[PDB]
Amino acid sequence: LKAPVVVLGAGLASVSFVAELRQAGYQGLITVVGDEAERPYDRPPLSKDFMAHGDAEKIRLDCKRAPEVEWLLGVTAQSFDPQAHTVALSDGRTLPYGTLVLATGAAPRALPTLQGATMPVHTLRTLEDARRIQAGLRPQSRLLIVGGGVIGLELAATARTAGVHVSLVETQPRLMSRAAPATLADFVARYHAAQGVDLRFERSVTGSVDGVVLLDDGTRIAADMVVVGIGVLANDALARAAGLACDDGIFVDAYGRTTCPDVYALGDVTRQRNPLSGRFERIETWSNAQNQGIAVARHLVDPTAPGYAELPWYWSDQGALRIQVAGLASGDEEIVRGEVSLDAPKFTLIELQKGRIVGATCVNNARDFAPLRRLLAVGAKPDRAALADPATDLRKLAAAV
Amino acid sequence: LKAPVVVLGAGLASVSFVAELRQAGYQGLITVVGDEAERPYDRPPLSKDFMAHGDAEKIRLDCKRAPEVEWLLGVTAQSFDPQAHTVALSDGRTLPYGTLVLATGAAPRALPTLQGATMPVHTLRTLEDARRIQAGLRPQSRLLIVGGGVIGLELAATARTAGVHVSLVETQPRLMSRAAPATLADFVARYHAAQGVDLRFERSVTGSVDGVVLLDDGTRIAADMVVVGIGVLANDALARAAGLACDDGIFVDAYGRTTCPDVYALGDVTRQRNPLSGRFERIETWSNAQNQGIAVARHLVDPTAPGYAELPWYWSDQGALRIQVAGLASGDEEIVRGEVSLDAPKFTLIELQKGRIVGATCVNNARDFAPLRRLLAVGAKPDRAALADPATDLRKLAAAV
Ligand SMILES: Cc1cc2nc3c(=O)[nH]c(=O)nc-3n(C[C@H](O)[C@H](O)[C@H](O)COP(=O)(O)OP(=O)(O)OC[C@H]3O[C@@H](n4cnc5c(N)ncnc54)[C@H](O)[C@@H]3O)c2cc1C
């Protein structure tokens, strides 16, 4: 590993990586450049508890496993020269590097049809965003959310709890089309509708006039605030300019290597192999950011260590639904454990492909999730009758493997 | 550039690259490993003149601009160790390298529903394939082609000229869906149908029984020979095993760099940025193989040289149609120069995006193609009236830019 180490971005992936470098035994220089003028913080609370409690000191990331790191907060890396091995900073300084790590994440995609709008329109990515939205979540106000993914739905739940009227516009015929089983998506729509969310499927926004949103069916929605959660775009501009292979995300191998010698990348900014699908994908989960960061650091310090190998998974807390999703959304088979019901929701889904577990969902059923992720990891082929059977406990079934 | 240079694959991309290394001034060792036991040869004649004239000595690639190269023909690279900087060969030998170049191309995709068939089924990629098919193109025989792309259609034309009855099965509703304007595809279907080709659209093969092919509509086609032209899969196995970033093709930047230090890749095996679309794609054209090979070599010898920057283009000779296609298949606008007619076909298409030329097609109109590629290269925005106007000659219009 070539010193000094410079990391661009100070999000979860960055913090996780630098903490692992130190824990693995690297004692040379580490400098982290973070464009946000904020003590590094975790994003999941921004759509939930922060949106509701407003204390940023409850959401900071623990940097104590990363001693002796200089964090340049409020500074933007403007470019890097991979021949000179330097990074140019917005404050006029230049940093030298032996190893450069791009952990610059992703930015919310903006709505092109609302580009010249005159009502409040916000995205939800940063603490600044969350505070700005927080200030607008007054009881009885009218919130329109654009996008029925995890941002929109987590915010929908938080807003309804605060007594805010919520309408939500989604272009697809379903919610969470990105990385969720249809059975889950259907249930989640039923849940939100029952909580008073006004869902609009297969509708695109065509624009707005004076505090009113226009749709593709030729109709209107008036709103006090719009929050746009329509996905992200990788923050890969420095990589594109420097000649790295990128396409809405920096291509990396399991060691986090880019196409440019001595430059690595990790987290939301990367496109990487999903071992379950065998395809290159942006894996934009909290667990990826942490675990890919850790694996890349571990292998830089110890080249004998394996490359990143974890299978993808996430959670989403949407009001009364604590959702956990691992692996692939579908296979050739779905097994449902429990009844799927709005009365005290509690169930598990298991996706199989030719008898092999390729994915799993738990809704208010955390006890089942860890054993299913272990079965997933080893490509388990359990008895499908037993997988369905309510009498089977999965912790023991996983233990038998 | 670190000597010695080892190239895996001895196709057009490989020959083009090694000739450029020598021409640019690199005088160190170059060793090329080619699995086919054939003097390097060009593939386009295999669906046409070779299929009809059968002389392989008319199709060899000119290696004289590549002096002092050892060509290991009939040898397969089995693996490489990018730490040890060695390549393991099927003949028991090992080659050292300073720089490793993966130019291993792509293999025809096989039909999963014909996997256990008992009639002749061939793909068309190699001289061996072409000879085997050649031997079967007897007058009045029944050929079924699976796939309505450039292989299938070029072969269809050659087979009809030889007096062979031709049926063709395509899964899409159109021919050449991969990289051809709809207007072209529609015309090409009319042309082949008029030449006696029995076209079947939106049909998938479900299998075969005793010299008869079964389709998804529940019908049959009996045939003496099947040729399968359903696309290719990148030959990226050595790269996948060695830990390079790959996904049906090796990701490279404009310098041909993979994610592994000292390992480059070029030609059909690569996924690379298409500057017109700004997306990563397999660019599987003859011009890419040659020109990407040349650009990668040039920049290895002279690091001040620019990365690969050419925009994609190809030709396809299908009987009486000499087709040339550059850039993107569609924009927001198509301009048609000439009438589109089976009576002495001759026309040009121009695809535009917000007034900018993004693609072009010429059918039996070669004079127009080079000037349109020049307009394409600079993102020209000519007068759209003039582009349509028959009186306009494009060579002069391009010259004005
Ligand atoms: C509201 C919200 C809720 C979420 N809830 C969940 C959840 O429950 N489950 C889950 O799995 N995930 C959730 N996610 C968390 C998300 O998965 C992680 O935040 C993300 O994966 C972390 O990835 P990262 O560190 O690579 O990128 P980021 O967190 O985006 O960090 C990158 C940082 O680099 C900075 N940067 C970019 N360019 C430059 C530059 N040139 N110079 C300097 N700095 C730069 C960025 O501004 C940013 O601060 C949520 C996200 C949001 C926004």
Ligand SMILES: Cc1cc2nc3c(=O)[nH]c(=O)nc-3n(C[C@H](O)[C@H](O)[C@H](O)COP(=O)(O)OP(=O)(O)OC[C@H]3O[C@@H](n4cnc5c(N)ncnc54)[C@H](O)[C@@H]3O)c2cc1C
């Ligand atoms: C019938 C036919 C007609 C065509 N007509 C046209 C046309 O008119 N227009 C057009 O634009 N293009 C046409 N193409 C030509 C095509 O575009 C070029 O042949 C191709 O782009 C060349 O790419 P390449 O050199 O990267 O790969 P390849 O030509 O596939 O060469 C790669 C070589 O590497 C070998 N190899 C693979 N793995 C190993 C290994 N482990 N060890 C050693 N060797 C290995 C392969 O077997 C192969 O010999 C046609 C192709 C075919 C098959």
Ligand SMILES: NC(=O)c1ccc[n+]([C@@H]2O[C@H](COP(=O)([O-])OP(=O)(O)OC[C@H]3O[C@@H](n4cnc5c(N)ncnc54)[C@H](O)[C@@H]3O)[C@@H](O)[C@H]2O)c1
């Ligand atoms: N629980 C969690 O894991 C969680 C929670 C919040 C945020 N995040 C992360 O934050 C990032 C952003 O999340 P997100 O929810 O914005 O993205 P998302 O990709 O999860 O969902 C975006 C949704 O918007 C829809 N959409 C796309 N274009 C639209 C348009 N033009 N109009 C209306 N709808 C449109 C999509 O079909 C999709 O359903 C993601 O990386 C996500 O993983 C994760």
Ligand SMILES: NC(=O)c1ccc[n+]([C@@H]2O[C@H](COP(=O)([O-])OP(=O)(O)OC[C@H]3O[C@@H](n4cnc5c(N)ncnc54)[C@H](O)[C@@H]3O)[C@@H](O)[C@H]2O)c1
């Ligand atoms: N003129 C030329 O540039 C030329 C000529 C011959 C070959 N080639 C090269 O050779 C390679 C192979 O060419 P190709 O024609 O096989 O591929 P192609 O991608 O050009 O076309 C394959 C066609 O088969 C269809 N198809 C896919 N699956 C099918 C299935 N299950 N059953 C029936 N049809 C199916 C596709 O829709 C497509 O139309 C390509 O890289 C091509 O560029 C080029």
